[PDB]
Amino acid sequence: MREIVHIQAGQCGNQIGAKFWEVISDEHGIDPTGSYHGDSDLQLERINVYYNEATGNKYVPRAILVDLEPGTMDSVRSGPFGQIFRPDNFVFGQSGAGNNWAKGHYTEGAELVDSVLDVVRKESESCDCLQGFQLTHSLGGGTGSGMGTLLISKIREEYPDRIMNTFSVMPSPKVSDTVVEPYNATLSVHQLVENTDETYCIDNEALYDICFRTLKLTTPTYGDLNHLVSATMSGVTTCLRFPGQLNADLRKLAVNMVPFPRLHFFMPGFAPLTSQYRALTVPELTQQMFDSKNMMAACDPRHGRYLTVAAIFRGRMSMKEVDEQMLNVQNKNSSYFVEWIPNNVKTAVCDIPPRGLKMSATFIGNSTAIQELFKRISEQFTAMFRRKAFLHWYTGEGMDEMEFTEAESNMNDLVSEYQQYQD
Amino acid sequence: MEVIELNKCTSGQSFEVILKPPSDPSLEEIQKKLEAAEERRKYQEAELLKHLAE
Amino acid sequence: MRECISIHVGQAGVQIGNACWELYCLEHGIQPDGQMPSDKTIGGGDDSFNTFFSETGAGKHVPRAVFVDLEPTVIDEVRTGTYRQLFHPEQLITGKEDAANNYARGHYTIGKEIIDLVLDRIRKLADQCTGLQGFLVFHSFGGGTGSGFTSLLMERLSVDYGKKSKLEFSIYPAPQVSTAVVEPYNSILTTHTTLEHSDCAFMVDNEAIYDICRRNLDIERPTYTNLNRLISQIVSSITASLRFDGALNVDLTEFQTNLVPYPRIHFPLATYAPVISAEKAYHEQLSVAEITNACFEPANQMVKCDPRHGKYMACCLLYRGDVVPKDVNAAIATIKTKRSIQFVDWCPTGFKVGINYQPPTVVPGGDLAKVQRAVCMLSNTTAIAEAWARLDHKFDLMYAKRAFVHWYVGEGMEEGEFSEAREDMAALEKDYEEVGV
Amino acid sequence: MYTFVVRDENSSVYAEVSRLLLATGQWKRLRKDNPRFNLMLGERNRLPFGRLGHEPGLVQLVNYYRGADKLCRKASLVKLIKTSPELSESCTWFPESYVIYTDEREVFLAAYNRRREGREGNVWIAKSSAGAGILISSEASELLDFIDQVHVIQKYLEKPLLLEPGHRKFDIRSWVLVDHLYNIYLYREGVLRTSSEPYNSADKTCHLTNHCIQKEYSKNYGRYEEGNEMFFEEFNQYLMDALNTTLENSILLQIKHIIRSCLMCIEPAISTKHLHYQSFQLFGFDFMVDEELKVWLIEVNGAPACAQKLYAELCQGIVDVAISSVFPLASIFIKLHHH
Numbered sequence A: 001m002r003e004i005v006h007i008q009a010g011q012c013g014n015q016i017g018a019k020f021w022e023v024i025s026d027e028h029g030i031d032p033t034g035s036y037h038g039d040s041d042l043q044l045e046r047i048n049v050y051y052n053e054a055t056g057n058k059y060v061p062r063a064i065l066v067d068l069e070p071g072t073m074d075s076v077r078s079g080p081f082g083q084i085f086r087p088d089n090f091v092f093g094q095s096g097a098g099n100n101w102a103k104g105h106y107t108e109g110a111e112l113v114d115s116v117l118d119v120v121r122k123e124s125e126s127c128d129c130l131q132g133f134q135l136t137h138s139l140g141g142g143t144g145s146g147m148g149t150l151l152i153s154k155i156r157e158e159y160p161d162r163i164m165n166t167f168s169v170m171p172s173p174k175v176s177d178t179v180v181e182p183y184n185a186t187l188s189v190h191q192l193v194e195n196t197d198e199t200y201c202i203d204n205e206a207l208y209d210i211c212f213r214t215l216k217l218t219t220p221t222y223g224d225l226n227h228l229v230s231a232t233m234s235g236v237t238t239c240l241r242f243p244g245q246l247n248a249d250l251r252k253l254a255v256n257m258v259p260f261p262r263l264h265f266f267m268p269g270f271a272p273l274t275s276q277y278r279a280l281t282v283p284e285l286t287q288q289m290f291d292s293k294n295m296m297a298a299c300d301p302r303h304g305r306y307l308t309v310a311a312i313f314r315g316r317m318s319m320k321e322v323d324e325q326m327l328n329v330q331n332k333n334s335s336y337f338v339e340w341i342p343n344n345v346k347t348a349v350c351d352i353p354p355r356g357l358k359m360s361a362t363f364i365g366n367s368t369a370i371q372e373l374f375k376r377i378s379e380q381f382t383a384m385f386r387r388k389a390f391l392h393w394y395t396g397e398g399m400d401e402m403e404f405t406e407a408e409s410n411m412n413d414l415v416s417e418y419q420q421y422q423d
Numbered sequence B: 001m002e003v004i005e006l007n008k009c010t011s012g013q014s015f016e017v018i019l020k021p022p023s024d025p026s027l028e029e030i031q032k033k034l035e036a037a038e039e040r041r042k043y044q045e046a047e048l049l050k051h052l053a054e
Numbered sequence C: 001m002r003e004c005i006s007i008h009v010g011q012a013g014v015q016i017g018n019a020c021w022e023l024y025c026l027e028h029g030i031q032p033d034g035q036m037p038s039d040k041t042i043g044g045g046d047d048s049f050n051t052f053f054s055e056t057g058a059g060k061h062v063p064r065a066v067f068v069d070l071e072p073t074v075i076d077e078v079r080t081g082t083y084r085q086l087f088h089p090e091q092l093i094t095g096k097e098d099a100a101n102n103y104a105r106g107h108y109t110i111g112k113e114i115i116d117l118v119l120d121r122i123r124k125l126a127d128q129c130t131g132l133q134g135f136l137v138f139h140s141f142g143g144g145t146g147s148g149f150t151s152l153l154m155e156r157l158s159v160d161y162g163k164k165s166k167l168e169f170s171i172y173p174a175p176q177v178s179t180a181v182v183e184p185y186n187s188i189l190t191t192h193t194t195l196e197h198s199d200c201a202f203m204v205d206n207e208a209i210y211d212i213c214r215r216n217l218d219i220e221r222p223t224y225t226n227l228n229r230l231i232s233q234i235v236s237s238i239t240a241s242l243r244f245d246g247a248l249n250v251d252l253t254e255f256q257t258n259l260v261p262y263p264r265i266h267f268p269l270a271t272y273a274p275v276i277s278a279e280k281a282y283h284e285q286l287s288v289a290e291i292t293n294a295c296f297e298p299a300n301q302m303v304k305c306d307p308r309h310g311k312y313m314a315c316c317l318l319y320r321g322d323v324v325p326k327d328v329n330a331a332i333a334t335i336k337t338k339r340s341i342q343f344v345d346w347c348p349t350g351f352k353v354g355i356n357y358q359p360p361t362v363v364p365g366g367d368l369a370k371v372q373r374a375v376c377m378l379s380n381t382t383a384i385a386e387a388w389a390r391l392d393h394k395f396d397l398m399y400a401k402r403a404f405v406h407w408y409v410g411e412g413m414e415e416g417e418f419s420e421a422r423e424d425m426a427a428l429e430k431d432y433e434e435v436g437v
Numbered sequence D: 001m002y003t004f005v006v007r008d009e010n011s012s013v014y015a016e017v018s019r020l021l022l023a024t025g026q027w028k029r030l031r032k033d034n035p036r037f038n039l040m041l042g043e044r045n046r047l048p049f050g051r052l053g054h055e056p057g058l059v060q061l062v063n064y065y066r067g068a069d070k071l072c073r074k075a076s077l078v079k080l081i082k083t084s085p086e087l088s089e090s091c092t093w094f095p096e097s098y099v100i101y102t103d104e105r106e107v108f109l110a111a112y113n114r115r116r117e118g119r120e121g122n123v124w125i126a127k128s129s130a131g132a133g134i135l136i137s138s139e140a141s142e143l144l145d146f147i148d149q150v151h152v153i154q155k156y157l158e159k160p161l162l163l164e165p166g167h168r169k170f171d172i173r174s175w176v177l178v179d180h181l182y183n184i185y186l187y188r189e190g191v192l193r194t195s196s197e198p199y200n201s202a203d204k205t206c207h208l209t210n211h212c213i214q215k216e217y218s219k220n221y222g223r224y225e226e227g228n229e230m231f232f233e234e235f236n237q238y239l240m241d242a243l244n245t246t247l248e249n250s251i252l253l254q255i256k257h258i259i260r261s262c263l264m265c266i267e268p269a270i271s272t273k274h275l276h277y278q279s280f281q282l283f284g285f286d287f288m289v290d291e292e293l294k295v296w297l298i299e300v301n302g303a304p305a306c307a308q309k310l311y312a313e314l315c316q317g318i319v320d321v322a323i324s325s326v327f328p329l330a331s332i333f334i335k336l337h338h339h
């Protein structure tokens, strides 16, 4: 009983979190009402990591839904699996945060954060041995970005010895709502540098390119983007949800993946990505899983070097052939793996494949090429900040220009820290 | 090639064959090191809570 | 009769210990419920098997074993396994959260909170012993519990049982089955602090067991179950002299006397033969000469290295099956005229030989074929330092960048313990070179 | 796509081999410290053999035999020949040698007095492995003073075979490649490193036939043959016109016998047959020929250089039988068969 508490905050965080629970409830055989209707004991073996067991053999997700607007969470409660969530775990306000990090972090969000921590405390008190927390949110908005990072700070204060894990959606001008997204993301990244142990960087630029270039969707929607995120979130948490030896909990994953405390930002990847009945061989899974076109961070791994890599294969396949192809990729491109961390690629196999796939592969890479993501955000930040453009939305909430300058310096420091280990 | 010290019993036997002749910390000190490490953990957490209080 | 207590720490120690006690029961005719029909002294006795099994008035033969793990899922396998009736709950010690592949977490943070409980449960077994020999300690090098908590336990055992001998069965890390990148750190941290507390340690490289299972058992992808069945055969070969009538290696002290002239160089190499697949309906039984010759093939060693480029300090041959001393000496005489077997000048060039007539026991339905005879060679070669060289080099690569070090400092360990542990391995690696060249 | 590393930049032989491997498009060179290699062109001193063969899914091969130094050191070769029953002290193709710093001082002076009293030629030569320092004398008291590293004193062949015209000394270099299956391949092409000065049996220029000494201390360098190097075609033609015999009959049969004897002797000690990594190695054998057409072994080189005219042929042969036999892509040697 190594429990995880899930938190989803803001519009993006709640829409992506809702799909995540829809996906893994299906994999574990949990129906939209909390009743288990599966056919394999592997489904219930580690079910308690994400689900509470209530009266009547009901499985209740250990999930807390947070937003400063009621709108999106009403759509979750009206969604397919909306009735499976604990009603008391819906914590929302009415003001919204207007895509404003200062409102989420300092004014509107501070008013609501205590009632979220009350729900977090109730879930933690019924945990046999809480591992830590996972948070889904975007960095470009106000609630998920500003209030989400405020939440993380206050969670760390009350549970300083627990792991903090986030799925963080990075903004991109390609898939943008407002021009202030680089401000919100830059302010949030520094919070994540200090207050998370593991962050999956999910780049909306990459999600768009994959939907358009690869999946052949000329007009991708947010729903299409979230299909890629759901499949990625299911893959990267397979080792937590099913029996296995490698990266079986959040702390062992962090010990395997994070050689330096600040460099804990991962590029996730998924294979296959098909626009569909054809069987995919193990060599094909391995080549696609490492292909840049399958990465969710919009960074070219050949532009940097892998510190650590986690690979997860799902389905009934030749584990011997899995080892051969994994060793084949490392031995044929060994220049992209740092030589000062021996055997930094770890592979795990799970027999249960995702829905609608005979087999699949999920990639989790700690690559120094991720600095291209932070460089990208830093340039967009500076393009406006050098003219103090749109700053009044933030100074009107009490913030000072110095806090933006310090956020700018902090992320450029992070970029430089990746650069020193790339050489 | 000498066989020496042959001992036989019901469940086996043993012997030696020669081919050529030749040519702690105390309980207190352990507790001190464990308590020193715990104090360094307490100091690092106190600095974290101080940083979060700021 | 003098008793021996087995202690199994971490997942590797517990699952290997589970495989050994299964084999012991099959070897001594002990049924899973603890009953032993061939034992005529009900509720007591000082036979050779009593060194490893105590007896209740009801006739149950209870292993003198303690299982310790910082996570309950592995020891719960023992509580609900085939031999669950053997153990009483006081022997199975579990925690809530494990050491997360972190030596410092197992040694300092979690070890401090559970060390008194483990020692107390060990004291309960020691109080049943009329003359305790000492302890056999099973653990991995790479796991946080197996490395970190074991080194703390070995320190306290030296304090609470100063005159008792302590032997190790250590699992050396192999990336083909390893689960952590920092296992070189844990291996060297735990070797440094345990070195002065262990009288004799048998290292088993998972790489060697893996390849022996692929090559000789035709297992394409061996599992821990495959690896542990083979390991339990080697361990049984080593401990058979403590559990059966005999005159060689009859107590733990004799292991040090026969295999370790220099106390720091206490890592004997183990070589086992033959390993035959059970799927073969009919395999030609190997002779004494053939299985003894196989003891000098690197492909059969528990640690891959080249004894030809080293020197021997001692060498024991442990036979089980249809073996008579006449065939042993004939095989040794031939092997001397073919093999590069150099002893150090300050030691006799010889072989202490032990023969047990009962052939090796295999687990029914397992991968190992029943054989008429088998041998385990325990030789103290300087060539085993190659494993230290490999391990120390990987340590040097990561530590030059301080990679993952913050995980250990974050648990209260000082950074100086890294360099202090590495300098000890450098001195150990230098001692082998002085003895072997 | 195979991978390899280079750890000896000063090797002219394997700098050419590495150049050929790249020219095939199926071999990729990694950094010198990358452990994920198929082939290691290792360093001469302190090669980390103990870290080889521990990479999952990689067949690793190295261009040196661990333990072959016993054959390629002055004192080690003498000790190996005397103490090995396969070679014995009655070995007829190796000059009577002694190790002088166990030590063989009293044993060397024992046979030394038997030659002075018996009116026989009593000239010896002292040398070691720490040279470019060699002394040749007929007085043992002078040889031992020069030593005062381990040195060896062997019988100086006072009756060498002399090429004419010139009345000059020489020595024969043979290149031998031993692959991972311990096949012994003798390169069909050898070289005679000839002295350019007339042999004076009564100055070390006409007595030492090294290519560096004849180019720095000899005034007739390059007179008879280019670079004081006579190849087998010219040398065989000379033996037919002068001595009415062939190179194969008079010399090469003994050379192949000596090569097999030395390498088969240490085969149990260095073979990588059942090892987790495989080895091959190129060797340089140095022979002397006396006036009776008897071949004597002088020394064995473990990291030999090649003749400039033969680098292309031999290095390609190294890739063919030593590297591509283990790693196939998409005869110049004489196989000395044995058991």
Ligand SMILES: Nc1nc2c(ncn2[C@@H]2O[C@H](COP(=O)(O)OP(=O)(O)OP(=O)(O)O)[C@@H](O)[C@H]2O)c(=O)[nH]1
Binding pocket: C009, C010, C011, C012, C013, C015, C016, C069, C070, C098, C099, C100, C101, C102, C106, C139, C140, C141, C142, C143, C144, C145, C146, C147, C171, C172, C173, C174, C177, C178, C179, C183, C206, C224, C225, C227, C228, C231
């Ligand atoms: N031969 C063998 N090796 C094992 C077994 N289980 C784990 N290992 C090895 O042990 C190392 C990991 O250490 P573990 O024993 O699993 O970890 P631990 O002692 O439980 O400590 P924690 O970090 O708290 O989990 C890896 O190198 C594994 O390959 C086993 O059953 N048999």
Ligand SMILES: Nc1ncnc2c1ncn2[C@@H]1O[C@H](COP(=O)(O)OP(=O)(O)CP(=O)(O)O)[C@@H](O)[C@H]1O
Binding pocket: D095, D125, D127, D131, D132, D154, D155, D156, D157, D158, D170, D171, D207, D208, D209, D210, D286, D288, D298, D299, D301
């Ligand atoms: N016993 C002996 N009788 C006659 N000449 C001898 C001799 N021992 C050595 N020499 C001569 O000395 C020369 C060099 O001897 P040696 O082989 O020890 O030098 P070296 O090892 O530095 C050359 P290389 O670079 O090939 O290793 C040879 O060319 C040989 O002619």
Ligand SMILES: Nc1nc2c(ncn2[C@@H]2O[C@H](COP(=O)(O)OP(=O)(O)O)[C@@H](O)[C@H]2O)c(=O)[nH]1
Binding pocket: A009, A010, A011, A012, A013, A015, A016, A097, A098, A099, A100, A138, A139, A140, A141, A142, A143, A144, A145, A169, A170, A171, A172, A175, A176, A177, A181, A204, A207, A222, A223, A225, A226, A229
């Ligand atoms: N992938 C994905 N991104 C989203 C979604 N909704 C919003 N975003 C992104 O998140 C940012 C806007 O933040 P949002 O979550 O709407 O603000 P919040 O409600 O205040 O937290 C922009 O970068 C959007 O591109 C979604 O459903 N999926």
Ligand SMILES: [Ca+2]
Binding pocket: A111
């Ligand atoms: Ca208000």
Ligand SMILES: [Ca+2]
Binding pocket: C039, C040, C041, C042, C043, C044, C045, C055
């Ligand atoms: Ca009894």
Ligand SMILES: [Ca+2]
Binding pocket: B024, C158, C162, C196, C197, C198
């Ligand atoms: Ca002691």
Ligand SMILES: [Mg+2]
Binding pocket: A011, A012, A141, A177
């Ligand atoms: Mg929005």
Ligand SMILES: [Mg+2]
Binding pocket: C010, C011, C071, C098, C099, C143, C145
């Ligand atoms: Mg464990």
Ligand SMILES: [Mg+2]
Binding pocket: D299, D300, D301
């Ligand atoms: Mg030389």
